[PDB]
Amino acid sequence: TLADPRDIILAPVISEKSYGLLDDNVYTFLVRPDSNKTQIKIAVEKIFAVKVASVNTANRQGKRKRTRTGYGKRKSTKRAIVTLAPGSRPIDLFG
Amino acid sequence: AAVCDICGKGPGFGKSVSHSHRRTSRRWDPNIQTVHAVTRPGGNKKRLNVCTSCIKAGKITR
């Protein structure tokens, strides 16, 4: 019944903006939509054992999509854009 | 007030009937009166609205 932060953080965002920020050591994660900056900070800091300078979040509405039975929405998501401390070690994301 | 706080007697519903026998709805309200009732002698009064039937009986005290 004990909660852990590896379930607040869902997945990394893979995109050209994501890589552009990775270049400057800024990592964008898909996070649980009900989470806030502070638990993202604590969560990243204790998952990857790094010093998080700042977490920036953006709520992103699910794309509405036409299909033969009607219109369906995709998942709504929340990005967390995490910038580490100026000199803290980069996280190893394996790709 | 048309409802007694002791016996719960309420208004009846019937008709006013004219000479032409046109009947329209009206009420027969109970003869509800305000009493300032006490539970024990010299006690604090409590405002009730009770029917004159309960007042005629010993259902309330002053």
Binding site: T1, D4, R6, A11, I14, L30, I47, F94 | -
Partner: protein, 68 residues
């Protein structure tokens, strides 16, 4: 893991193996996102295992089949 073979885990290494199941679901999720794992059945399996551990842990403190 199986419900029977996760019974010999007593009280705390069961939670600790729940922790490593959570961790491996994390990493397997990340390799899903980056496309660097081949067998995608693994996260179904790991999620089921997490559910198994949670279930057994709930029974033990609800009063069923407890013991080291």
């Amino acid at each position: 893991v199986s419900p029977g073979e996760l019974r010999e885990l007593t009280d705390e290494e069961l939670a600790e193996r729940l922790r490593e199941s959570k961790e491996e679901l994390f990493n397997l999720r990340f390799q899903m996102a980056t496309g660097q794992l081949n067998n995608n059945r693994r996260l179904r399996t790991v999620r089921q295992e997490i559910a198994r551990i949670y279930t057994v842990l709930r029974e033990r403190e609800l009063g069923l089949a407890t013991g080291p």
